[PDB]
Design a protein around this ligand. Structure first.
Ligand code: K
Ligand code: K
Ligand code: MG
Ligand code: MG
Ligand code: MG
Ligand code: MG
Ligand code: MG
Ligand code: MG
Ligand code: MG
Ligand code: MG
Ligand code: MG
Ligand code: MG
Ligand code: MG
Ligand code: MG
Ligand code: MG
Ligand code: MG
Ligand code: MG
Ligand code: MG
Ligand code: MG
Ligand code: MG
Ligand code: MG
Ligand code: MG
Ligand code: MG
Ligand code: MG
Ligand code: MG
Ligand code: MG
Ligand code: MG
Lengths: 50, 107, 63, 153
RNA sequence: CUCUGGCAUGUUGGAACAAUGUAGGUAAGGGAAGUCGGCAAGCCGGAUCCGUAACUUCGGGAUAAGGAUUGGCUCUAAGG
RNA sequence: CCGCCGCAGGUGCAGAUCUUGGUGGUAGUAGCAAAUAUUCAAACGAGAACUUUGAAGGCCGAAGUGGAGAAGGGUUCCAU
Protein backbone atom coordinates (compact mmCIF):
# COMPACT_ATOMS: atom_id res chain seq x y z
CA UNK A 1 0.00 0.00 0.00
CA UNK A 2 1.07 3.66 -0.37
CA UNK A 3 0.82 3.83 3.43
CA UNK A 4 3.84 1.94 4.82
CA UNK A 5 5.98 2.01 7.95
CA UNK A 6 9.68 2.76 7.78
CA UNK A 7 10.50 -0.82 8.78
CA UNK A 8 8.40 -2.32 5.98
CA UNK A 9 9.77 0.12 3.42
CA UNK A 10 13.34 -0.65 4.46
CA UNK A 11 12.52 -4.35 4.22
CA UNK A 12 11.19 -3.91 0.68
CA UNK A 13 14.35 -1.96 -0.17
CA UNK A 14 16.60 -4.92 0.62
CA UNK A 15 14.42 -7.31 -1.38
CA UNK A 16 14.63 -5.11 -4.55
CA UNK A 17 18.44 -4.70 -4.24
CA UNK A 18 18.91 -8.50 -3.89
CA UNK A 19 16.66 -9.28 -6.90
CA UNK A 20 19.36 -8.68 -9.58
CA UNK A 21 21.22 -11.15 -11.93
CA UNK A 22 24.78 -12.21 -11.20
CA UNK A 23 27.58 -10.08 -12.67
CA UNK A 24 28.80 -11.77 -15.88
CA UNK A 25 32.40 -11.67 -14.66
CA UNK A 26 31.57 -13.88 -11.61
CA UNK A 27 31.51 -16.84 -13.99
CA UNK A 28 35.13 -16.30 -15.17
CA UNK A 29 36.54 -16.63 -11.58
CA UNK A 30 38.42 -19.87 -10.66
CA UNK A 31 36.39 -22.68 -8.97
CA UNK A 32 33.09 -20.97 -10.01
CA UNK A 33 29.94 -23.16 -10.00
CA UNK A 34 27.31 -20.32 -9.87
CA UNK A 35 25.93 -20.15 -13.43
CA UNK A 36 22.81 -18.02 -12.58
CA UNK A 37 21.08 -16.44 -9.57
CA UNK A 38 18.82 -19.12 -8.11
CA UNK A 39 17.27 -16.68 -5.60
CA UNK A 40 15.52 -14.42 -8.14
CA UNK A 41 12.05 -13.29 -6.97
CA UNK A 42 9.31 -12.24 -9.39
CA UNK A 43 6.67 -9.98 -7.86
CA UNK A 44 3.77 -11.85 -9.44
CA UNK A 45 4.98 -15.43 -8.99
CA UNK A 46 6.32 -15.67 -5.43
CA UNK A 47 5.21 -13.27 -2.73
CA UNK A 48 7.37 -11.88 0.04
CA UNK A 49 4.84 -12.79 2.72
CA UNK A 50 6.42 -9.86 4.56
CA UNK B 1 -2.15 -4.97 -72.43
CA UNK B 2 -0.77 -5.66 -68.96
CA UNK B 3 -2.18 -2.42 -67.52
CA UNK B 4 -5.95 -2.23 -68.01
CA UNK B 5 -8.87 -0.65 -66.17
CA UNK B 6 -12.46 -1.90 -66.22
CA UNK B 7 -15.69 -1.08 -64.39
CA UNK B 8 -17.86 -3.90 -63.04
CA UNK B 9 -21.06 -4.45 -61.03
CA UNK B 10 -20.60 -7.17 -58.36
CA UNK B 11 -23.86 -8.70 -57.05
CA UNK B 12 -22.70 -8.87 -53.38
CA UNK B 13 -26.16 -10.22 -52.43
CA UNK B 14 -25.69 -13.54 -54.35
CA UNK B 15 -22.10 -13.81 -53.01
CA UNK B 16 -23.06 -13.34 -49.29
CA UNK B 17 -26.32 -15.30 -49.40
CA UNK B 18 -26.69 -17.41 -46.28
CA UNK B 19 -23.81 -15.82 -44.35
CA UNK B 20 -24.38 -15.03 -40.70
CA UNK B 21 -25.08 -11.50 -39.55
CA UNK B 22 -21.71 -10.89 -37.89
CA UNK B 23 -19.87 -12.20 -40.97
CA UNK B 24 -21.84 -10.59 -43.86
CA UNK B 25 -19.72 -7.45 -44.26
CA UNK B 26 -16.33 -9.22 -43.80
CA UNK B 27 -17.41 -11.96 -46.26
CA UNK B 28 -18.35 -9.22 -48.75
CA UNK B 29 -14.77 -7.93 -48.63
CA UNK B 30 -13.50 -11.47 -49.21
CA UNK B 31 -15.92 -12.05 -52.09
CA UNK B 32 -14.83 -8.76 -53.73
CA UNK B 33 -11.18 -9.67 -53.29
CA UNK B 34 -11.65 -13.07 -54.90
CA UNK B 35 -13.78 -11.47 -57.60
CA UNK B 36 -10.78 -9.32 -58.54
CA UNK B 37 -8.39 -12.27 -58.66
CA UNK B 38 -10.65 -14.24 -60.99
CA UNK B 39 -11.15 -11.29 -63.34
CA UNK B 40 -7.73 -9.61 -63.43
CA UNK B 41 -5.97 -12.96 -62.98
CA UNK B 42 -3.59 -11.70 -60.31
CA UNK B 43 -3.24 -12.14 -56.56
CA UNK B 44 -2.23 -9.18 -54.36
CA UNK B 45 -5.52 -7.31 -54.72
CA UNK B 46 -5.70 -3.99 -52.87
CA UNK B 47 -9.16 -2.70 -51.84
CA UNK B 48 -9.43 1.12 -51.59
CA UNK B 49 -10.46 2.38 -48.14
CA UNK B 50 -13.52 4.06 -49.76
CA UNK B 51 -14.77 0.68 -51.11
CA UNK B 52 -14.35 -0.75 -47.58
CA UNK B 53 -16.31 2.23 -46.19
CA UNK B 54 -18.98 1.70 -48.88
CA UNK B 55 -19.44 -2.01 -48.03
CA UNK B 56 -19.57 -1.14 -44.32
CA UNK B 57 -21.80 1.92 -44.80
CA UNK B 58 -24.95 0.07 -43.70
CA UNK B 59 -23.37 -1.83 -40.83
CA UNK B 60 -22.10 -5.36 -40.59
CA UNK B 61 -25.19 -7.34 -41.64
CA UNK B 62 -27.15 -5.12 -44.06
CA UNK B 63 -24.53 -5.06 -46.83
CA UNK B 64 -25.62 -3.27 -50.04
CA UNK B 65 -26.94 -5.75 -52.60
CA UNK B 66 -24.93 -4.44 -55.55
CA UNK B 67 -21.75 -2.36 -55.82
CA UNK B 68 -20.04 -0.71 -58.82
CA UNK B 69 -16.28 -1.08 -58.78
CA UNK B 70 -13.32 -0.18 -60.94
CA UNK B 71 -10.65 -2.87 -61.32
CA UNK B 72 -7.42 -1.20 -62.46
CA UNK B 73 -4.55 -3.66 -62.99
CA UNK B 74 -1.27 -1.80 -62.40
CA UNK B 75 2.42 -2.64 -62.27
CA UNK B 76 4.00 -3.51 -58.93
CA UNK B 77 7.44 -2.41 -60.09
CA UNK B 78 7.82 0.05 -57.20
CA UNK B 79 8.70 -2.88 -54.93
CA UNK B 80 10.85 -6.00 -55.31
CA UNK B 81 7.86 -8.28 -54.77
CA UNK B 82 7.11 -11.75 -56.18
CA UNK B 83 4.06 -10.32 -57.97
CA UNK B 84 4.76 -7.97 -60.86
CA UNK B 85 1.11 -6.97 -61.38
CA UNK B 86 -1.44 -6.03 -58.73
CA UNK B 87 -5.08 -4.95 -58.90
CA UNK B 88 -6.49 -1.91 -57.12
CA UNK B 89 -10.29 -2.09 -56.65
CA UNK B 90 -11.91 1.34 -56.31
CA UNK B 91 -15.48 2.48 -55.47
CA UNK B 92 -17.75 3.91 -58.17
CA UNK B 93 -20.84 5.62 -56.71
CA UNK B 94 -23.88 5.24 -58.95
CA UNK B 95 -27.49 6.37 -58.80
CA UNK B 96 -28.84 3.12 -60.24
CA UNK B 97 -27.64 -0.33 -61.28
CA UNK B 98 -30.06 -0.83 -64.18
CA UNK B 99 -28.61 -1.47 -67.66
CA UNK B 100 -25.08 -0.96 -66.20
CA UNK B 101 -22.67 -3.37 -68.01
CA UNK B 102 -18.94 -4.23 -67.74
CA UNK B 103 -17.04 -1.48 -69.59
CA UNK B 104 -13.43 -0.55 -70.36
CA UNK B 105 -11.90 2.65 -69.00
CA UNK B 106 -9.48 4.47 -71.28
CA UNK B 107 -6.50 6.28 -69.77
CA UNK C 1 6.69 2.82 -35.62
CA UNK C 2 5.04 2.79 -32.18
CA UNK C 3 3.28 5.96 -31.05
CA UNK C 4 1.72 4.97 -27.72
CA UNK C 5 3.93 7.48 -25.90
CA UNK C 6 2.99 10.27 -28.31
CA UNK C 7 -0.70 9.35 -28.26
CA UNK C 8 -0.61 9.34 -24.42
CA UNK C 9 1.41 12.54 -24.25
CA UNK C 10 -0.80 14.36 -26.76
CA UNK C 11 -3.96 13.44 -24.81
CA UNK C 12 -2.41 14.88 -21.67
CA UNK C 13 -1.28 18.10 -23.36
CA UNK C 14 -4.49 18.59 -25.35
CA UNK C 15 -6.47 17.71 -22.18
CA UNK C 16 -8.69 15.35 -24.16
CA UNK C 17 -9.17 11.64 -24.44
CA UNK C 18 -6.94 9.43 -26.52
CA UNK C 19 -9.93 8.95 -28.83
CA UNK C 20 -9.81 12.66 -29.78
CA UNK C 21 -6.08 12.79 -30.53
CA UNK C 22 -5.24 12.74 -34.24
CA UNK C 23 -1.65 11.93 -35.19
CA UNK C 24 -0.93 12.57 -38.86
CA UNK C 25 -0.82 9.18 -40.63
CA UNK C 26 1.52 10.60 -43.26
CA UNK C 27 4.19 12.36 -41.19
CA UNK C 28 4.60 9.66 -38.54
CA UNK C 29 8.40 9.84 -38.64
CA UNK C 30 8.40 13.38 -37.24
CA UNK C 31 5.82 12.40 -34.63
CA UNK C 32 7.84 9.32 -33.68
CA UNK C 33 10.98 11.23 -32.71
CA UNK C 34 9.06 13.33 -30.17
CA UNK C 35 9.58 12.00 -26.64
CA UNK C 36 8.86 15.13 -24.60
CA UNK C 37 5.81 17.24 -23.94
CA UNK C 38 7.71 20.25 -25.31
CA UNK C 39 8.01 18.54 -28.68
CA UNK C 40 4.40 17.38 -28.56
CA UNK C 41 3.32 20.99 -28.00
CA UNK C 42 5.35 22.07 -31.03
CA UNK C 43 3.77 19.36 -33.17
CA UNK C 44 0.38 20.59 -31.96
CA UNK C 45 1.27 24.17 -32.99
CA UNK C 46 2.71 22.86 -36.27
CA UNK C 47 -0.60 21.10 -36.93
CA UNK C 48 0.78 17.56 -36.98
CA UNK C 49 -1.31 16.63 -33.93
CA UNK C 50 -4.86 17.98 -33.68
CA UNK C 51 -7.80 17.58 -31.34
CA UNK C 52 -10.75 15.97 -33.08
CA UNK C 53 -14.19 17.54 -32.57
CA UNK C 54 -16.70 15.99 -30.11
CA UNK C 55 -19.02 13.46 -31.79
CA UNK C 56 -22.31 15.18 -32.62
CA UNK C 57 -25.17 14.33 -30.25
CA UNK C 58 -27.93 16.65 -31.42
CA UNK C 59 -30.91 17.42 -29.17
CA UNK C 60 -32.91 18.71 -32.16
CA UNK C 61 -35.00 15.52 -32.15
CA UNK C 62 -35.74 16.01 -28.45
CA UNK C 63 -36.55 19.71 -28.86
CA UNK D 1 28.62 -34.83 -35.37
CA UNK D 2 27.66 -38.40 -36.17
CA UNK D 3 24.80 -38.73 -38.65
CA UNK D 4 23.00 -42.10 -38.17
CA UNK D 5 24.31 -43.08 -41.64
CA UNK D 6 27.75 -42.12 -43.06
CA UNK D 7 27.49 -40.99 -46.75
CA UNK D 8 28.59 -43.48 -49.49
CA UNK D 9 30.73 -40.95 -51.38
CA UNK D 10 31.54 -38.18 -48.86
CA UNK D 11 33.00 -35.87 -51.51
CA UNK D 12 29.72 -35.99 -53.46
CA UNK D 13 27.55 -35.39 -50.38
CA UNK D 14 26.41 -32.48 -48.26
CA UNK D 15 24.88 -32.61 -44.80
CA UNK D 16 22.77 -30.36 -42.60
CA UNK D 17 21.44 -30.86 -39.08
CA UNK D 18 19.54 -29.00 -36.40
CA UNK D 19 18.99 -29.61 -32.72
CA UNK D 20 16.17 -28.69 -30.33
CA UNK D 21 13.88 -27.36 -33.06
CA UNK D 22 10.52 -26.21 -31.66
CA UNK D 23 8.45 -28.02 -34.28
CA UNK D 24 6.20 -31.00 -33.69
CA UNK D 25 8.16 -34.23 -33.98
CA UNK D 26 5.20 -36.28 -35.19
CA UNK D 27 4.35 -33.75 -37.90
CA UNK D 28 7.97 -33.40 -38.98
CA UNK D 29 8.58 -37.16 -39.15
CA UNK D 30 5.64 -37.58 -41.51
CA UNK D 31 6.87 -34.66 -43.62
CA UNK D 32 10.46 -35.92 -43.84
CA UNK D 33 9.30 -39.36 -44.98
CA UNK D 34 7.49 -37.66 -47.86
CA UNK D 35 10.58 -35.88 -49.21
CA UNK D 36 12.95 -38.81 -48.69
CA UNK D 37 14.51 -39.83 -51.98
CA UNK D 38 13.32 -36.69 -53.76
CA UNK D 39 15.41 -34.39 -55.89
CA UNK D 40 16.21 -31.17 -54.06
CA UNK D 41 14.27 -29.14 -56.63
CA UNK D 42 11.27 -31.49 -56.39
CA UNK D 43 11.43 -31.39 -52.59
CA UNK D 44 11.63 -27.59 -52.52
CA UNK D 45 8.62 -27.30 -54.81
CA UNK D 46 6.72 -29.97 -52.88
CA UNK D 47 7.26 -28.38 -49.47
CA UNK D 48 6.11 -24.97 -50.71
CA UNK D 49 2.96 -26.59 -52.10
CA UNK D 50 2.41 -28.02 -48.61
CA UNK D 51 2.54 -24.51 -47.17
CA UNK D 52 0.04 -23.53 -49.88
CA UNK D 53 -2.09 -26.64 -49.23
CA UNK D 54 -1.76 -27.82 -52.84
CA UNK D 55 0.04 -31.07 -51.99
CA UNK D 56 -0.46 -32.87 -48.69
CA UNK D 57 1.85 -34.76 -46.37
CA UNK D 58 0.39 -38.27 -45.89
CA UNK D 59 0.26 -39.26 -42.22
CA UNK D 60 1.00 -42.99 -42.21
CA UNK D 61 2.25 -43.78 -38.66
CA UNK D 62 1.05 -40.84 -36.55
CA UNK D 63 -2.42 -40.69 -38.10
CA UNK D 64 -4.64 -41.09 -35.03
CA UNK D 65 -7.58 -38.81 -35.68
CA UNK D 66 -5.99 -37.24 -38.76
CA UNK D 67 -8.64 -36.41 -41.33
CA UNK D 68 -9.00 -37.59 -44.90
CA UNK D 69 -8.20 -35.45 -47.92
CA UNK D 70 -8.35 -35.83 -51.69
CA UNK D 71 -4.69 -34.87 -52.06
CA UNK D 72 -3.62 -38.03 -50.22
CA UNK D 73 -4.63 -40.24 -53.15
CA UNK D 74 -1.28 -39.10 -54.71
CA UNK D 75 0.59 -41.01 -51.92
CA UNK D 76 -1.67 -44.11 -52.08
CA UNK D 77 -3.08 -43.18 -48.61
CA UNK D 78 -6.42 -41.77 -47.32
CA UNK D 79 -5.22 -39.54 -44.48
CA UNK D 80 -3.21 -36.36 -45.10
CA UNK D 81 -2.50 -32.90 -43.71
CA UNK D 82 -0.49 -29.79 -44.58
CA UNK D 83 1.85 -29.14 -41.66
CA UNK D 84 3.10 -25.65 -42.40
CA UNK D 85 5.70 -25.21 -39.67
CA UNK D 86 7.31 -28.59 -40.34
CA UNK D 87 7.59 -27.76 -44.05
CA UNK D 88 9.19 -24.37 -43.33
CA UNK D 89 11.69 -25.94 -40.94
CA UNK D 90 12.60 -28.53 -43.56
CA UNK D 91 12.72 -25.87 -46.29
CA UNK D 92 15.07 -23.78 -44.12
CA UNK D 93 17.30 -26.82 -43.61
CA UNK D 94 17.29 -27.83 -47.28
CA UNK D 95 18.55 -24.34 -48.28
CA UNK D 96 21.32 -24.66 -45.70
CA UNK D 97 22.24 -28.06 -47.12
CA UNK D 98 22.19 -26.45 -50.57
CA UNK D 99 24.60 -23.75 -49.39
CA UNK D 100 26.86 -26.46 -47.97
CA UNK D 101 26.89 -28.22 -51.34
CA UNK D 102 27.89 -24.96 -53.02
CA UNK D 103 30.66 -24.41 -50.47
CA UNK D 104 31.93 -27.87 -51.42
CA UNK D 105 31.46 -27.17 -55.14
CA UNK D 106 28.75 -29.68 -55.97
CA UNK D 107 26.21 -29.69 -58.77
CA UNK D 108 23.15 -28.35 -56.96
CA UNK D 109 20.57 -29.49 -59.51
CA UNK D 110 21.61 -33.10 -59.12
CA UNK D 111 21.31 -33.55 -55.34
CA UNK D 112 18.90 -36.11 -53.92
CA UNK D 113 17.86 -36.48 -50.29
CA UNK D 114 19.12 -40.00 -49.64
CA UNK D 115 19.03 -39.84 -45.83
CA UNK D 116 16.72 -37.83 -43.58
CA UNK D 117 16.13 -38.57 -39.90
CA UNK D 118 13.92 -36.89 -37.30
CA UNK D 119 14.72 -37.63 -33.65
CA UNK D 120 12.69 -36.59 -30.60
CA UNK D 121 14.61 -33.89 -28.66
CA UNK D 122 14.48 -33.13 -24.90
CA UNK D 123 10.92 -31.91 -24.02
CA UNK D 124 10.25 -28.48 -22.54
CA UNK D 125 8.08 -28.00 -19.46
CA UNK D 126 4.89 -25.91 -19.56
CA UNK D 127 1.84 -26.28 -17.25
CA UNK D 128 -1.91 -26.27 -17.75
CA UNK D 129 -4.51 -25.80 -15.03
CA UNK D 130 -7.29 -28.37 -14.70
CA UNK D 131 -10.48 -28.73 -12.70
CA UNK D 132 -10.36 -29.13 -8.91
CA UNK D 133 -7.05 -27.33 -8.46
CA UNK D 134 -5.02 -29.77 -10.56
CA UNK D 135 -1.97 -28.92 -12.66
CA UNK D 136 -1.11 -31.10 -15.66
CA UNK D 137 1.89 -31.20 -18.01
CA UNK D 138 1.70 -29.08 -21.15
CA UNK D 139 4.77 -30.31 -22.96
CA UNK D 140 6.45 -29.39 -26.23
CA UNK D 141 7.85 -32.18 -28.41
CA UNK D 142 10.76 -30.68 -30.36
CA UNK D 143 12.97 -32.67 -32.68
CA UNK D 144 16.53 -33.06 -33.95
CA UNK D 145 16.63 -33.25 -37.78
CA UNK D 146 19.50 -34.40 -39.97
CA UNK D 147 19.76 -35.01 -43.69
CA UNK D 148 22.39 -35.93 -46.26
CA UNK D 149 22.10 -35.03 -49.95
CA UNK D 150 24.03 -36.79 -52.70
CA UNK D 151 24.55 -36.13 -56.39
CA UNK D 152 22.73 -38.44 -58.79
CA UNK D 153 23.20 -38.70 -62.55
C1' C E 1 -30.17 3.94 -27.56
C1' U E 2 -26.59 8.04 -27.40
C1' C E 3 -22.34 11.96 -25.60
C1' U E 4 -17.61 12.43 -22.45
C1' G E 5 -14.10 8.83 -21.35
C1' G E 6 -12.64 3.68 -22.51
C1' C E 7 -12.22 -0.82 -25.18
C1' A E 8 -11.07 -4.81 -29.36
C1' U E 9 -15.06 -9.50 -27.76
C1' G E 10 -12.21 -11.65 -22.89
C1' U E 11 -5.45 -17.40 -23.72
C1' U E 12 -6.12 -18.47 -31.17
C1' G E 13 -7.48 -17.89 -36.26
C1' G E 14 -9.43 -19.96 -41.29
C1' A E 15 -13.16 -23.01 -43.93
C1' A E 16 -17.76 -25.56 -43.75
C1' C E 17 -23.13 -25.71 -41.86
C1' A E 18 -23.69 -33.40 -40.90
C1' A E 19 -25.53 -36.15 -36.63
C1' U E 20 -25.89 -35.43 -31.15
C1' G E 21 -25.76 -31.30 -28.12
C1' U E 22 -25.79 -26.23 -25.28
C1' A E 23 -28.76 -21.36 -25.82
C1' G E 24 -32.94 -19.04 -28.36
C1' G E 25 -37.63 -19.30 -31.40
C1' U E 26 -41.91 -20.80 -34.18
C1' A E 27 -45.57 -24.51 -35.19
C1' A E 28 -51.94 -26.75 -38.54
C1' G E 29 -55.81 -29.15 -35.53
C1' G E 30 -56.37 -30.82 -30.39
C1' G E 31 -55.27 -28.87 -25.46
C1' A E 32 -52.09 -32.11 -19.95
C1' A E 33 -54.68 -37.17 -23.43
C1' G E 34 -47.61 -36.31 -21.39
C1' U E 35 -45.68 -37.05 -16.46
C1' C E 36 -44.77 -39.35 -9.85
C1' G E 37 -46.32 -34.46 -10.34
C1' G E 38 -48.38 -28.82 -15.60
C1' C E 39 -41.51 -30.11 -14.51
C1' A E 40 -40.43 -26.81 -18.57
C1' A E 41 -42.71 -23.48 -21.46
C1' G E 42 -46.69 -20.72 -22.20
C1' C E 43 -50.86 -17.37 -20.51
C1' C E 44 -51.10 -12.51 -17.49
C1' G E 45 -48.55 -8.00 -17.12
C1' G E 46 -48.00 -0.67 -17.54
C1' A E 47 -51.48 3.18 -16.97
C1' U E 48 -56.64 5.47 -17.02
C1' C E 49 -61.80 4.62 -16.06
C1' C E 50 -65.34 1.11 -14.18
C1' G E 51 -66.24 -3.20 -11.09
C1' U E 52 -64.61 -6.24 -7.07
C1' A E 53 -66.85 -12.20 -3.58
C1' A E 54 -66.42 -15.90 0.55
C1' C E 55 -64.20 -15.06 4.94
C1' U E 56 -62.27 -11.78 8.62
C1' U E 57 -58.39 -10.77 14.43
C1' C E 58 -62.74 -5.38 10.73
C1' G E 59 -56.71 -3.85 9.95
C1' G E 60 -57.48 -6.83 5.43
C1' G E 61 -58.73 -10.27 1.50
C1' A E 62 -57.49 -6.59 -3.15
C1' U E 63 -53.83 -5.34 -8.66
C1' A E 64 -59.57 -10.23 -5.66
C1' A E 65 -62.38 -11.83 -9.78
C1' G E 66 -64.37 -9.46 -14.33
C1' G E 67 -64.65 -5.29 -18.31
C1' A E 68 -63.36 -1.19 -21.42
C1' U E 69 -59.63 2.22 -23.26
C1' U E 70 -54.60 3.18 -25.09
C1' G E 71 -51.27 5.52 -31.75
C1' G E 72 -50.82 9.99 -34.95
C1' C E 73 -52.64 14.68 -36.06
C1' U E 74 -55.59 19.24 -35.42
C1' C E 75 -58.20 21.65 -31.74
C1' U E 76 -61.24 23.14 -27.23
C1' A E 77 -61.46 24.04 -21.73
C1' A E 78 -59.18 24.26 -17.09
C1' G E 79 -55.28 24.68 -13.47
C1' G E 80 -50.46 30.53 -12.55
C1' C F 1 40.97 -54.86 -10.79
C1' C F 2 40.73 -60.11 -9.84
C1' G F 3 41.89 -65.86 -8.40
C1' C F 4 42.74 -69.08 -4.14
C1' C F 5 42.72 -70.01 1.80
C1' G F 6 40.07 -67.92 5.84
C1' C F 7 37.11 -63.73 8.03
C1' A F 8 32.70 -60.30 8.07
C1' G F 9 27.90 -58.58 6.41
C1' G F 10 23.04 -53.18 5.52
C1' U F 11 24.68 -59.81 0.36
C1' G F 12 20.90 -61.68 -4.62
C1' C F 13 13.71 -58.94 -6.35
C1' A F 14 8.66 -59.28 -10.49
C1' G F 15 5.18 -58.26 -7.62
C1' A F 16 4.18 -55.16 -1.63
C1' U F 17 -2.82 -49.73 -4.91
C1' C F 18 6.01 -50.89 -2.74
C1' U F 19 9.84 -45.96 -2.73
C1' U F 20 12.38 -42.44 -6.02
C1' G F 21 13.68 -41.22 -10.93
C1' G F 22 12.74 -41.88 -16.04
C1' U F 23 9.44 -43.39 -20.26
C1' G F 24 5.37 -45.00 -23.35
C1' G F 25 0.14 -46.45 -25.76
C1' U F 26 -3.84 -43.25 -25.23
C1' A F 27 -2.55 -38.96 -29.01
C1' G F 28 -1.17 -34.96 -32.76
C1' U F 29 -6.42 -37.19 -29.47
C1' A F 30 -9.78 -34.25 -25.76
C1' G F 31 -9.45 -29.55 -26.14
C1' C F 32 -7.77 -23.95 -27.06
C1' A F 33 -16.94 -22.57 -27.76
C1' A F 34 -19.62 -17.85 -21.06
C1' A F 35 -20.22 -12.13 -21.57
C1' U F 36 -22.94 -9.32 -30.15
C1' A F 37 -17.55 -7.69 -34.05
C1' U F 38 -14.79 -6.86 -36.86
C1' U F 39 -12.96 -4.57 -41.80
C1' C F 40 -9.68 -1.44 -45.25
C1' A F 41 -5.14 0.96 -46.13
C1' A F 42 -0.29 2.37 -44.66
C1' A F 43 4.14 2.21 -41.45
C1' C F 44 8.09 -0.34 -38.97
C1' G F 45 10.10 -4.98 -39.68
C1' A F 46 13.75 -10.93 -41.92
C1' G F 47 8.67 -12.04 -40.64
C1' A F 48 1.95 -9.07 -39.42
C1' A F 49 -5.38 -12.20 -38.45
C1' C F 50 -2.92 -10.19 -33.48
C1' U F 51 2.09 -4.15 -32.99
C1' U F 52 1.49 1.15 -34.38
C1' U F 53 -1.08 5.18 -37.24
C1' G F 54 -5.31 6.71 -40.04
C1' A F 55 -10.37 5.47 -41.79
C1' A F 56 -14.86 2.62 -41.10
C1' G F 57 -18.39 -0.48 -38.42
C1' G F 58 -19.46 -1.88 -33.14
C1' C F 59 -19.71 -2.31 -27.70
C1' C F 60 -19.31 -0.42 -22.28
C1' G F 61 -23.63 3.43 -21.77
C1' A F 62 -22.43 7.74 -15.78
C1' A F 63 -25.39 1.25 -10.66
C1' G F 64 -19.45 2.06 -16.96
C1' U F 65 -15.43 -1.89 -20.00
C1' G F 66 -15.03 5.87 -17.37
C1' G F 67 -12.15 8.96 -13.60
C1' A F 68 -9.79 8.46 -8.37
C1' G F 69 -8.79 5.86 -3.55
C1' A F 70 -8.62 2.13 1.16
C1' A F 71 -6.75 -2.87 2.22
C1' G F 72 -3.33 -6.11 -0.18
C1' G F 73 0.74 -6.24 -3.68
C1' G F 74 6.07 -4.11 -3.71
C1' U F 75 8.71 -1.58 -8.37
C1' U F 76 4.45 -4.33 -11.13
C1' C F 77 5.36 2.72 -12.40
C1' C F 78 8.49 5.35 -16.64
C1' A F 79 12.03 5.29 -20.73
C1' U F 80 15.21 2.51 -23.88
K1 K G 1 -51.59 -34.11 -16.50
K1 K H 1 -4.78 0.79 -2.35
MG1 MG I 1 -1.57 -13.57 -6.85
MG1 MG J 1 -10.19 -36.27 -36.77
MG1 MG K 1 -9.74 -32.97 -44.49
MG1 MG L 1 -8.03 -25.02 -17.10
MG1 MG M 1 -8.05 -23.48 -7.23
MG1 MG N 1 -17.96 -13.56 -29.50
MG1 MG O 1 -10.03 -11.75 -30.86
MG1 MG P 1 -8.71 -12.26 -19.62
MG1 MG Q 1 -43.50 -17.61 -37.77
MG1 MG R 1 -50.23 -26.00 -31.94
MG1 MG S 1 -53.83 -22.63 -33.41
MG1 MG T 1 -59.09 -24.94 -24.24
MG1 MG U 1 -52.58 -38.16 -16.83
MG1 MG V 1 -49.94 -42.17 -18.80
MG1 MG W 1 -42.59 -23.26 -13.36
MG1 MG X 1 -58.32 -15.15 -2.81
MG1 MG Y 1 28.40 -53.02 4.54
MG1 MG Z 1 18.78 -55.72 2.32
MG1 MG a 1 11.93 -53.71 -9.93
MG1 MG b 1 7.59 -62.88 -5.51
MG1 MG c 1 -9.19 -31.78 -32.51
MG1 MG d 1 -13.49 -26.35 -29.55
MG1 MG e 1 -26.06 -4.28 -23.42
MG1 MG f 1 -24.92 0.86 -26.17
MG1 MG g 1 -29.12 1.12 -15.60
Amino acid sequence: SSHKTFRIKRFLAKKQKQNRPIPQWIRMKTGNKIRYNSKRRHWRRTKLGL
Amino acid sequence: NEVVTREYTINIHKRIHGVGFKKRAPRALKEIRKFAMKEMGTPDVRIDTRLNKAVWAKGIRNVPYRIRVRLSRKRNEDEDSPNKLYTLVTYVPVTTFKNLQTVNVDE
Amino acid sequence: SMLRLQKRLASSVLRCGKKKVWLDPNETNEIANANSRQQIRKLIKDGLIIRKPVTVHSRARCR
Amino acid sequence: VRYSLDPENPTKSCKSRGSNLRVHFKNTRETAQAIKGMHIRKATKYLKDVTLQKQCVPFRRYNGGVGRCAQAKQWGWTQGRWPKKSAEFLLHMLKNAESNAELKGLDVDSLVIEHIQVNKAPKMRRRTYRAHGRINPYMSSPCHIEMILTEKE
